[PDB]
């Protein structure tokens, strides 16, 4: 074999401890760049003028943050959607002031994570598996796209991208609520059903399989030793688990087909999270949550508040206080 | 400016121009948060634009009533609104029945493009597996991983 | 793909119980503290610095400003038994909005 | 920054005490007969 052939054989090899693959050829460098920049920035980056108003926000540990307050801060509103690579700055000091690390990190990450998804397809193919794990990963991936790319596009700035940090994340959430009433949007509601339900069904599946494990061990050892990696025989009694669950509710509400069960376990969280992602991606173009502000009126025309109006008061609080020096005109239009 | 403001020289709270400032390459642009939108171009605004951006003499002397009308119209039909078609910001009261066609068209087509990407992945992955002969599962008697060396 | 993997099916399915069950139980402990207003509201070190240094800003300080808005703007209607009257002039607001 | 001056020792022992516990149990497991 020639060099290219040998190289291709290595890249696509099923015997590498970690699969590389063609997706991996892009994933590995982009993820390493994003990671290294993030780590250094999170530790040592100076303050960043997120809102383009010469009001720099400190995100790094060395500049007075802890793990909870810290962040890599979004690029400046002055930049908007412009591409701000290192080489468009006059110096690294300028690059840093303007939030250049954010763009480098999110662009390398989104490319790398997209290739992580491709790589899941690729290895499934090399190993003779069915191909759709990558489709389940499209749900968190789409969500990362929504908050780091689609929302900025809609609003016209990477300054409105989710910050890379814990408190930064909460800031993004509170301002999103003020601006889009996300809680009242059915796609975020589906998202909640997706993750609360994913958690519920996770606990339920775990508990039911654990309930029905076949006795293979004694009281002074972990029941886990009753299963051996690669054994042919199933390790729990699905008939007993179904016998249980079908009586807990009623018979036809319980799955007696493992394939159907495991498909439901995939589909419920994945579909819900796809709607979560689509919620963010469509509120990106300001189709917002349901607005029932003053929807209930009495015979005279007096407003009779509902819980929607109370939400509205909270939202107003968020709206009027956020980015307190950035607005000069009465309406926040993006 | 009708009230007497000198809009080129008016310093906002942050030190940036309240009405007018510079883009990162120096072009004169509107200030406030709309600094992000300085790449916008439109026929009602372009007559005010000079070689270096928004021109202060054109601003002071050449703004026509049709431009005022158009800007007022567009400011008050911004593409923001609720799912039940209450126009305006999320905290606005019921009154105006409006969601921009631009919001309807962009959101619908995002949703559809997204699910079409998902369908691309679903069908491309399936096409591959079917072509190679393992779309229905792993052959118990010829499980490929069982013929591969262990990773460790 | 990821570097590690399950090898033991009993462990796997136990872990599926443990994770969400433990999470919920932790959230409950926090709410028990909130019953008493025993919050994680502040980082004292942050507040000392910010009080002394008007140029020091983090996402933590930004969120508290949002919180102050929420409280002032929602309290009068959300807590009617307090008969709050907050004159326009006391309401916390940023520029313009 | 004016941090709590017991945060360092609190954090160090929070890590070291249970980590030590686990390392002791692991190593004595390995040294048992195969």
């Amino acid at each position: 074999a020639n060099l290219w052939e040998r190289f291709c054989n290595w890249v696509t090899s099923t015997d590498n401890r970690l699969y590389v693959g063609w997706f991996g050829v892009i994933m590995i460098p982009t993820l390493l760049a994003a990671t290294i920049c993030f780590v250094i920035a999170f530790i040592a980056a100076p303050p960043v003028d997120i809102d383009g108003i010469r009001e720099p926000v400190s995100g790094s540990l060395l500049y007075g943050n802890n793990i909870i307050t810290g962040a890599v801060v979004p690029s400046s509103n002055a930049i908007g959607l412009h591409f701000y690579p290192i080489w468009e700055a006059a110096s690294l000091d300028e690059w840093l002031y303007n939030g250049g690390p954010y763009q480098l990190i999110i662009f390398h990450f989104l490319l790398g994570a997209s290739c992580y998804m491709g790589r899941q397809w690729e290895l499934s193919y090399r190993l003779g598996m069915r191909p759709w794990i990558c489709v389940a990963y499209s749900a968190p991936l789409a969500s990362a796209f929504a908050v780091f790319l689609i929302y900025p596009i809609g609003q016209g700035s990477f300054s409105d991208g989710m910050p890379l940090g814990i408190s930064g994340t909460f800031n993004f959430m509170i301002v999103f609520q003020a601006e889009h009433n996300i809680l009242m949007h059915p796609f975020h509601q589906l998202g909640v059903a997706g993750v609360f339900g994913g958690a519920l069904f996770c606990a339920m599946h775990g508990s039911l399989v654990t309930s029905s494990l076949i006795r293979e061990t004694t009281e002074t050892e972990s029941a886990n030793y009753g299963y051996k990696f690669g054994q042919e025989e199933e390790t729990y009694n699905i008939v007993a688990a179904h016998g249980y669950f079908g009586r807990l509710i009623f018979q036809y509400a319980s799955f007696n087909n493992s394939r159907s069960l495991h498909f439901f376990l995939a589909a419920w969280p994945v579909v819900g999270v796809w709607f979560a992602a689509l919620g963010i991606s469509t509120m990106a173009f300001n189709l917002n949550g349901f607005n029932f502000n003053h929807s209930v009126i009495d015979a005279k025309g007096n407003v009779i508040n509902t819980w929607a109006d109370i939400i509205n008061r909270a939202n107003l609080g968020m709206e009027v206080m956020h980015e307190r020096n950035a607005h000069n005109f009465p309406l926040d239009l993006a | 400016q009708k009230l007497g403001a000198n809009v080129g020289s008016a310093q906002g709270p942050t030190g940036l121009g309240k009405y007018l400032m510079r883009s990162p390459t120096g072009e004169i642009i509107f200030g406030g948060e709309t600094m992000r939108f300085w790449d916008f171009r439109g026929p009602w605004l372009e007559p005010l634009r000079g070689p270096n951006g928004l021109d202060l003499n054109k601003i002071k002397n050449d703004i026509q009533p049709w431009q005022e009308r158009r800007a007022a119209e567009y400011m008050t039909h911004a593409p923001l609104g609720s799912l039940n078609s209450v126009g305006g910001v999320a905290t606005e009261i019921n009154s105006v029945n409006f969601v921009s066609p631009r919001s309807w068209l962009a959101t619908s087509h995002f949703v559809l493009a997204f699910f079409f990407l998902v369908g691309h992945l679903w069908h491309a992955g399936r096409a591959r597996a079917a072509a190679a002969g393992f779309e229905k599962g792993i052959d118990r008697e010829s499980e490929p991983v069982l013929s591969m060396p262990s990773l460790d | 793909i990821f570097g590690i993997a399950f090898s033991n099916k009993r462990w796997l399915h136990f872990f599926m119980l443990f994770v969400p069950v433990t999470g919920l139980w932790m959230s409950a402990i926090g709410v028990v503290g909130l019953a008493l207003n025993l919050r994680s509201y502040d980082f004292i070190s942050q507040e000392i610095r910010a009080a002394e240094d008007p140029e020091f800003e983090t996402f933590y300080t930004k969120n508290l400003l949002l919180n102050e808005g929420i409280r002032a703007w929602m309290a009068p209607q959300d807590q009617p038994h307090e008969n709050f009257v907050f004159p326009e002039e006391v309401l916390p607001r940023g520029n313009a909005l | 920054m004016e941090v709590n001056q017991l945060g360092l020792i609190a954090t160090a022992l929070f890590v070291l005490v249970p980590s030590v516990f686990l390392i002791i149990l692991y190593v004595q497991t390995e040294s048992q007969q195969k």
């Binding site: 401890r17 060395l62 802890n66 793990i67 990696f229 054994q231 | - | - | 360092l8």
Partner: peptide
Amino acid sequence: METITYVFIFACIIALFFFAIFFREPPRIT
């Protein structure tokens, strides 16, 4: 001291990832 402590914990986590991956107990079939 605070910064050192955060970075130290993170770096221990990263080392752990390395050992958990490359020096795992290898899975063995029966």
